[PDB]
Write a protein that binds this ligand. Structure first.
Ligand code: GDP
Ligand code: ADP
Lengths: 369, 176
């Protein structure tokens, strides 16, 4: 199985280019895309080596980089121009899909704040038209900005099969808190570490989690509640890493309860004490879970790249993510009373209201029906 | 025979040759390399075979020992792995490059007696041994190996240090 990545807008190209640099250095791949002498299954993200990227001014600075051998602002303006080059960009994808052995999914890296955001919303719909059996995971990044943000939300709630949220307000606070930057090329260092760590169990094979659906099938309970948040602690026993991930200071998100948790421990930790820690974390009751259906916490180990110590990443599904949509929602209404049909905004405003209504009702003892 | 077999160890810049005195040829020859992960230490052919997952070191790259920690590992490998003998049970004759610093000679001696507890040992200049093998005690030897070449005038069994010349051109350079 293989996973084709797409990079849209200024953000997608930058965080994708930094994702590939980190992923090339994590492996034994020279900047000239040639394997150096110096186990890690790399057929999923690299093609025999060529990355399976589809990039869409910034391209020139990439081509002037040492990695050249590795390959307006409205939403309506970003939607229309994609329609006029509909056939163009798909030929690149159609040859890469059929040239691929057995396609699995489509990773999308884009910022929803505007030509790239508009182009993204267009492409997300067409992929549902052509390929019905391919997952679409989107590494969206949150910030007329309220308008564009909610429109793409209308597509991300019914088209994208999964979604991992990364908001700049939580990342910028971290850079000033634990990095003391006072830049885009600086916070992207953290975004690259989370992205590279997200697909760790795919490149280093283990007994479990050898496919992208294996990670997603546990967290997302119903096709509607497909939003996730992240947590990265080291900015050492396994009990220490679990307790530091469940603190609010580390999450990348600005009653409520958890639906499912996945922990990625990438160190050389002792794999015999991992089952012990899950016995004791349950006793302190550090996290509150859904009352309707059963839920648990998941811990998965891996191996760090020797060519480059314990780290940790936490993928969670918390209903407190509903607050982020509320801010965009409330920000939209204030502009709607202040200034060919303007009916698409009405439908998008309505459908996101149902998503928020699902979350607040997802925390009740009778979410069934 | 009352005496145990004596060992002969030729320390080469690229390949070490080891065996037993009296034999017509060395019993083992292996790369003068020690490797550690990028089993904790790899020496000889194995280090070469698994170089992909190791960082290689060449402790006697140009004929002169530069890292005694890894040279000690090469000698350990020589006795226990290649020859399968206990050094404390056999005298050991070691070879050295021409113009080998005096301090290095003392170091080799101390290591054999204190680290390997050899019952006896001796060190001879490589070029001199080659001359002996040809049935002579006088002559000039042109020794060209892997990482270094030397022209060594020898008279009556004694190398003449003032006339010895070193040429940093050998097999390695020719291969490249
Ligand atoms: N997280 C993150 N967001 C970025 C980065 N660069 C740009 N963005 C986002 O992208 C938005 C600007 O989009 P822009 O590049 O003007 O769109 P375009 O002109 O259509 O490509 C801003 O609101 C930023 O939040 C980055 O390096 N990291
Ligand atoms: N028949 C040959 N012709 C040319 N070069 C050779 C031949 N056999 C071995 N060599 C070269 O000789 C070198 C090793 O010789 P050697 O005297 O063992 O060196 P050292 O003692 O420094 O390790 C290597 O560079 C090897 O390629």
């Amino acid at each position: 199985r293989e996973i084709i990545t797409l990079q849209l807008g200024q953000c997608g190209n930058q965080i994708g280019f930094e994702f590939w640099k980190q992923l090339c250095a994590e492996h034994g791949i020279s900047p000239e895309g040639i394997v150096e002498e110096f186990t890690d299954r790399k057929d999923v993200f690299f093609y025999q080596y060529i990355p399976r990227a589809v990039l869409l001014r910034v391209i020139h600075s990439i081509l002037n980089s040492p990695y050249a051998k590795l390959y307006g602002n409205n939403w309506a303006s970003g939607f229309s121009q994609g329609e006029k080059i509909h056939e163009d960009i798909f030929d690149i994808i159609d040859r890469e899909a059929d040239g691929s052995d057995s396609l699995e999914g489509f990773v999308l890296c884009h910022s929803i704040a505007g030509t790239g955001s508009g182009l993204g919303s267009y492409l997300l719909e067409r992929l549902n038209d052509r390929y019905p059996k391919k997952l679409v995971q989107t590494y969206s990044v949150f910030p007329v900005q309220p308008y564009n943000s909610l429109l793409t939300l209308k597509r991300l709630t019914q088209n994208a099969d999964c979604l991992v949220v990364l908001d700049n307000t939580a990342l910028n606070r971290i850079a000033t808190d634990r990095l003391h930057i006072q830049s885009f090329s600086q916070i992207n260092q953290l975004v690259s570490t989370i992205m590279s760590a997200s697909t760790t169990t795919l490149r280093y094979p283990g007994y479990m989690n050898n496919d992208l659906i294996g990670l997603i099938a546990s967290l997302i309970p119903t096709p509607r509640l497909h939003f996730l948040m992240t947590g990265y602690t080291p900015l050492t026993t396994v009990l220490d890493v679990m307790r530091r991930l469940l603190q609010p200071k580390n999450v990348m998100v600005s009653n409520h309860c958890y639906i499912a948790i996945l922990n990625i421990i990438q160190g050389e930790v002792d794999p015999t004490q991992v089952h012990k820690s899950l016995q004791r974390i349950r006793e302190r009751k550090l996290a509150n879970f859904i009352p309707w259906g059963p839920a648990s916490i998941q811990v998965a180990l891996s191996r760090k790249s020797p060519y480059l110590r314990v780290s940790g990443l936490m993928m969670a599904n918390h209903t407190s993510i509903s607050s982020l949509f509320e801010r965009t929602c409330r920000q939209y209404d204030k502009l709607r009373k202040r200034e060919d049909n303007f009916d698409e905004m009405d439908t998008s405003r309505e459908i996101v209201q149902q998503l928020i209504d699902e979350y607040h009702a997802a925390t009740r003892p009778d979410y069934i029906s | 025979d009352e005496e145990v077999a004596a060992l002969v160890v030729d320390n080469g810049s690229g390949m070490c040759k080891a065996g037993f005195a009296g034999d017509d040829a060395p019993r083992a020859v292996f790369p003068s390399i020690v490797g550690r992960p990028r089993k904790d230490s790899y020496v000889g052919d194995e280090a070469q075979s698994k170089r992909g997952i190791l960082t290689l070191k060449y402790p006697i790259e140009h004929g002169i020992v530069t890292n005694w920690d890894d040279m000690e590992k090469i000698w350990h490998h020589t006795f226990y792995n290649e020859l399968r003998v206990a050094p404390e049970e056999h005298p050991v004759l070691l070879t050295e490059a021409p113009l080998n610093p005096k301090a290095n000679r003392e170091k080799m001696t101390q290591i054999m007696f204190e680290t390997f507890n050899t019952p006896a040992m001796y060190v001879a200049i490589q070029a001199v041994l080659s001359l002996y093998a040809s049935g002579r005690t006088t002559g000039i030897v042109l020794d060209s190996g892997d990482g270094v070449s030397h022209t060594v005038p020898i008279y009556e069994g004694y190398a003449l240090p003032h006339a010895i010349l070193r040429l940093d051109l050998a097999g390695r350079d020719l291969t490249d």
